[PDB]
Amino acid sequence: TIRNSEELRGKAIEQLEKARARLKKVEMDADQFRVNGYSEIEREKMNLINSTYKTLEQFEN
Amino acid sequence: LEVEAKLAEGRKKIEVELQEALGSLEQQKEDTIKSLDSQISALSDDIVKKVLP
């Protein structure tokens, strides 16, 4: 019974170490992805305004 | 929506530029018809030498 209890304490504490490591690494994915997608849609914003300004100059042509 | 409104306003501006340019050139051709009359006389006098051998 001693063996069962202290093995369960050790395996659960490394399970929570790997789970908290996964929390920090998936938060790293989350905020890296936040910066990435945010800047990506601002350059796609500038892509949209470039397309419309170009078709306006096509119109005046 | 913001750049589509900019497109529509620019399109109105170029339309009014069009009407100004076309009315100007119609006034211009009114001027060259109302003027340019020795051209008319000489152009009649030139073809009369071509209708006959």
- For residue A34, CA distances in Å to A21, A25, A39, B44 come to 19, 14, 9, 81
Burial of A56 (0-12, 13-18, 19+ CB in 10 A): middle
> Do residues A56 and B10 touch, judged by C-beta distance below 8 A?
yes
DSSP label of B35: S
- What tokens appear for B46 in the block? 């030139």
B10 contacts in chain A (CB < 8 Å): 56
Please give the single-letter amino acid code of residue A55.
T
Which A residues, 30 through 49, put their C-beta within 8 Å of a C-beta on chain B?
48-49
Experimental approach: cryo-EM
Please give the single-letter amino acid code of residue B6.
K
A51 contacts in chain B (CB < 8 Å): none
Partner B contacted by A58 (CB < 8 A): no
Q: Is there a contact between B10 and A52 if contact means CB atoms under 8 Å apart?
A: no
What angle (nearest 5°) sits at the alpha carbon of residue B31, between those of residues B28 and B37?
135
Of A12, A53, A28, give the one whose Cα is nearest residue B3: A53
User: Rounded to the nearest 10 degrees, how much is the dihedral formed by the CA atoms of A9, A12, A14, A19?
Assistant: -150
How many angstroms separate the CA atoms of A43 and A50, rounded?
A: 10
Please give the single-letter amino acid code of residue A20.
R
